[PDB]
Amino acid sequence: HMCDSALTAQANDLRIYQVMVESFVNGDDAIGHGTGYGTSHHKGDLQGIIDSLDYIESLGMNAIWLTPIFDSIPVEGQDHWADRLDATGYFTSNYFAVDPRFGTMEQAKELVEKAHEKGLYVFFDGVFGHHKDNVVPSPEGRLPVGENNPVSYPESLAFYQEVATFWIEELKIDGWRLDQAYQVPTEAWTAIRASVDEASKSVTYVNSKGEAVNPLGYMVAEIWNNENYIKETGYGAEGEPALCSAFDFPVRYRVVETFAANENGIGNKGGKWLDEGMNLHRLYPSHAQPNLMLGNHDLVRFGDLLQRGNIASPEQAEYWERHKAALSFQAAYSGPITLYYGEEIGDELEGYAQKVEQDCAVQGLCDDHVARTSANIDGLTVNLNEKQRDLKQYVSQLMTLRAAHPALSRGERTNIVANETVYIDHKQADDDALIYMVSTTADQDTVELKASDIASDGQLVDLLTGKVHSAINGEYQISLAPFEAKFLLIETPSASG
Ligand SMILES: OC[C@H]1O[C@H](O[C@H]2[C@H](O)[C@@H](O)[C@@H](O)O[C@@H]2CO)[C@H](O)[C@@H](O)[C@@H]1O
Ligand SMILES: [Ca+2]
Ligand SMILES: [Ca+2]
């Protein structure tokens, strides 16, 4: 059945902060895995997330996504690789209990309640295609069926329906990020989504505004592939929706290939490349709600990508301008967006940039986990420097701007310019029309823009600085610094646009 349309409006407003639990904040030094895949302290826990909720909210985020927190039970005599895998949460044993290296059921309850108190949605990480060999039966006596990886469908469906509704009914979480979602067939996703919607509509909590609300029931698939595969294995056909939201890996790659370079070194692209990527949204069915991230726990940090391509390093101003340009693109992107912890301060692993292959896992340096670095949370685990504070304040400005302007989060996109040096989108929702423009070049340039090309009948006003841009003979002349972004309100839109 259809993507439930109330969630659709809510989902376009999501600004999600992703935390990798084991590598985030060691809030209780008495517990923690103490080993894992990555260079972090490996003692991140639920208390550390609870300690970070004020920080996450002040960033302007309105939701948090935790990597799996369920109980990965060690088996006597298992090797250190298995010890490290237990720290990731992605090969779990008891889907219905909290891993004690992260915390207790009571602390997981406390976390969700306090997040809701502060106006944040909470999403958990559901791995419904695989698990550890010692999986334990559900409270209702169910087990997944088949191999440990991947499990068999539809034999395993009843079990994972029970998992997916349990955490909603017990903790009132607002939905699920779905790991490696193509391991679960589309018919199963339709039924799991029905279970999620039914469980969500069966409970309420009091949000920060004082209203009793159902948990969102949001579900976002991780399908690390191009649009044709995200459609085939995630969204389903037009008229027969499987899932309603999936991560926008294709545009993530276009963004890092424009403002940095990707892990394989493709980079130095321009606005034309970004536009071509956004245009491929036309391949998706009408119900698809792509979710743009710049990175995650499986991708190299943006700042390390900048160093890997010999593009920039934190000692150079351009390192920060490129972060701002990439984050500004996310802020202008309609639909849910996800920020990976540390991008807001330009994090990067000291001493690391080039790809490390031999012996990378025992070092914490493989591409697929090197971003799992100890979190730098201002006032909690770090005192930020001037450039770090400047980027974090910029991100707070973007998230605030996004919250106030429907054109950014749910506006219709019309590309105005997409060449090698600039990218200009017109965004409009109801009576909110603006221009998003971002430089894609290390050269200062002045952009000549016809008011008649953007349905502007008057001035343009910068929504962050308030600078007014007036037309002469119907044309604006806008100076763009290298990789500068501008959010320009169309103060008087034309009768027709
Ligand atoms: O030692 C093998 C392998 O383990 C890790 O890969 C994990 C990953 O960390 C988990 O998050 C999840 O995706 O499962 C993977 C195993 O299937 C290391 O990240 C990886 O480098 C290493 O080769
Ligand atoms: Ca700890
Ligand atoms: Ca580095």
Residue numbers in the entry: 0 to 496
From the reporting publication:
The GH13_37 subfamily is the most recently established α-amylase subfamily. It was created on the basis of the isolation and phylogenetic analysis of a novel α-amylase, designated AmyP, from a marine metagenomic library. AmyP exhibits high substrate specificity for starch over pullulan or cyclomaltodextrins, efficiently hydrolyzing starch into glucose, maltose and maltotriose. AmyP is a raw-starch-degrading enzyme (RSDE), thus making it of potential interest in the food processing and green-fuels communities. The AmyPΔSBD is composed of A, B, and C domains and shares structural features with other GH13 α-amylases.
The crystal structure of WT AmyPΔSBD complexed with maltose was obtained through co-crystallization of full-length WT AmyP with β-cyclodextrin (β-CD), an unpreferred substrate of AmyP (AmyP/β-CD). This structure was determined to a resolution of 1.95 Å by using the AmyP-E221Q/γ-CD structure as an initial model. The structure of AmyP-E221Q/γ-CD contains electron density representing a maltotriose molecule bound to the active site and occupying subsites -1, -2 and -3, whereas the structure of AmyP/β-CD contains electron density representing a maltose molecule at subsites -2 and -3. These observations suggested that the E221Q mutant possesses activity for γ-CD and the WT enzyme possesses activity for β-CD at the high concentration in the crystallization drop, thus producing maltotriose from γ-CD and maltose from β-CD, respectively. The maltose bound to the active pocket of the WT enzyme also superimposed well at subsites -2 and -3 with the maltotriose bound to the active site of the E221Q mutant. The observed binding of maltose in subsites -2 and -3 indicated that the affinity of subsite -3 for a glucose residue is greater than that of subsite -1. The observation that G2 binds in subsites -2 and -3 indicates tighter binding in these subsites than in subsite -1, which is consistent with the production of a limit digest of G1, G2 and G3 by the enzyme. It seems likely that a strong -3 subsite would protect G3 from rapid digestion, whereas a weak -1 subsite would limit the formation of glucans smaller than G3. The AmyPΔSBD-E221Q/G3 and AmyPΔSBD/G2 structures can therefore explain the nature of the limit digest of G1, G2 and G3 by the AmyP enzyme.
